């Protein structure tokens, strides 16, 4: 039930091409997604986009 409420509240949000996140009407929620503009699915480090020491050893 908690997840059904969170889905019905959040599902309209989408990341536009100018990298803002706007609601269904067009009001801005965030000017950039999460401050940096980065995907959580591509985080190689602890919530950071790279881990430089591992890449340099690579």
């Amino acid at each position: 039930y908690m997840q059904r409420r969170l889905v019905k509240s959040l599902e309209d949000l989408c990341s536009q091409y100018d990298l803002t996140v706007r609601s269904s009407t067009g009001d801005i929620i965030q000017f950039i997604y999460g401050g940096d503009g980065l995907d959580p699915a591509a985080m190689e480090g602890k919530d950071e986009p790279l881990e430089f020491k591992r890449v340099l050893d690579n």
Partner: protein, 49 residues
């Protein structure tokens, strides 16, 4: 129809619709919840609605 004994077919629930929203598969969600369930052409008047 509903169950196995009626040769019924499965159910896209309220949660698998959410999961298909999460991928951003717009046309797959359209195809599942319209074309392979009940497709129908209406004609809507544009002036009176």
């Amino acid at each position: 129809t509903e169950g196995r004994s009626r040769d019924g077919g499965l159910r896209l629930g309220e949660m698998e619709r959410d999961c298909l929203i999460g991928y951003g598969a717009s046309m797959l969600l359209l195809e599942r919840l319209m074309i392979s369930s009940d497709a129908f052409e209406v004609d809507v008047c544009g002036q009176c609605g």
